[PDB]
Design a protein around this ligand. Structure first.
Ligand SMILES: CCCN1CC(COc2ccc([C@@H]3c4ccc(O)cc4CC4(CC4)N3C(=O)c3ccccc3)cc2)C1
Ligand SMILES: CCCN1CC(COc2ccc([C@@H]3c4ccc(O)cc4CC4(CC4)N3C(=O)c3ccccc3)cc2)C1
Lengths: 206, 226
């Protein structure tokens, strides 16, 4: 029942902190620590906690790598040709099978830069990833109605910025098509890299 | 291409549609050979269809090749899902090759992809996906799948592709408006359809893993004018 502005404000307030950092060990440890904060972010995405825990976990399990990637790309926008894994861990291209994903992450930053992706748009995109990556009756209906609400909210953000109706639906499409590439990176990422579900369940107990 | 009305975009895409091909005129042991032969014959028609997607032949040959290398499996899959939409629980690879889940169980890792395709077909069925929407979505896959994995020329190329993608977005919205959808419903349905493309990409990546081109794409795309 939230308004678009209340949706945006809830997502903005829910943003996780930027954590700080042998290379792969460090990146794995950073990712593991960010995942905890991801869980607490997800609990604040409006609509998420109305799902069963089993469904909260399947969605997090499907989405977590995409969410880490889009977060990395978002905080890397202002660092052309580099990835800001942490404020103390800025890596460029020159830093097997890694450069291919690195280039794909860099291409995403470049796309966000070309689009001038806004922060309010970023948090909507992350929320969509959370609710969408695992959707493939009543529980899915609810997921789709929350997803619909985020679509309403993105359009509202674009109207408030003064875009024409045409530009609104063009930009909405451009943003959602980026999510196909983020999925693609996640799949390649998974290839390149106790069930995670048990870990996610434990994390939900704080 | 950038001057087409939405109705002219729909018309060009509908006319460009490839034919529905058949399998040879069956067994678990011969099934993969039949599916591979079907895909190979469909790929030829794909190329011809791509050349008829407005704006596609404005690109360099190298970029046309790149886009089709990136998108061909997704395009085969979305075509399959569309043909299968009115056959619940089954995949209509061809009019004479309608397969159920159990026929996939015979090949390792096959049923997982089969189930994802079935769920996409069920989702299109639930949304009552229209043929005019389908051809827009397939044209989006062609132009979008490879656009993040490509000089001043390259920048011009990418800008062109995004302008054509934008025109197909306008066309999708025009279609939904003509169908009587409120403006909220139009934006929502647009988003729902585009998010399914994320899942089609997911299936393609899993499918490529399971299945395990360029100069062949070249030879059909690099036609002479004789
Ligand atoms: C819960 C126990 C299981 N864990 C053990 C499991 C390790 O998973 C992970 C391990 C490492 C990472 C890093 C990471 C860290 C933080 C970040 O914000 C973003 C990323 C990006 C990411 C692309 C994915 N990555 C890489 O190194 C990378 C590789 C190739 C090219 C470029 C980058 C993410 C996930 C998960
Ligand atoms: C020079 C080009 C090389 N060739 C490229 C040639 C192999 O690629 C292909 C080989 C087979 C296929 C079939 C096929 C055929 C027609 C169709 O419309 C759709 C599909 C769907 C598809 C999912 C992809 N598939 C499967 O069997 C399948 C597997 C697991 C679950 C479900 C189905 C597609 C592509 C070798």
């Amino acid at each position: 029942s939230l308004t678009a502005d209340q949706m945006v404000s809830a997502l903005l307030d829910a943003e996780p902190p930027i954590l700080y950092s042998s290379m792969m060990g460090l990146l794995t440890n950073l990712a593991d620590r960010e995942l905890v904060h991801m869980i607490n972010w997800a609990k604040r995405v409006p609509g998420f906690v109305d799902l069963t825990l089993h469904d909260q976990v399947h969605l997090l399990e499907s989405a977590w790598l995409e969410i880490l990637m889009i977060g990395l790309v978002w905080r890397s926008m202002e660092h052309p040709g580099k990835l800001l894994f942490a404020p103390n861990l800025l890596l460029d291209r020159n830093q097997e099978g890694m450069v291919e994903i690195f280039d794909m992450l860099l291409a995403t930053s470049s796309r966000f830069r070309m689009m001038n992706l806004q922060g309010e748009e970023f948090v909507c995109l992350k929320s969509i990833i959370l609710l969408n990556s695992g959707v493939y009756l009543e529980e899915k209906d609810h997921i789709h109605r929350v997803l619909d609400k985020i679509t309403d909210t993105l359009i509202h953000l674009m109207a408030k910025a003064g875009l024409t109706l045409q530009q609104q639906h063009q930009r909405l499409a451009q943003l959602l098509l980026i999510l196909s590439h983020i999925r693609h990176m996640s799949n390649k990422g998974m290839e390149h890299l106790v069930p995670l579900s048990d870990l996610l369940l434990e994390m939900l107990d704080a």
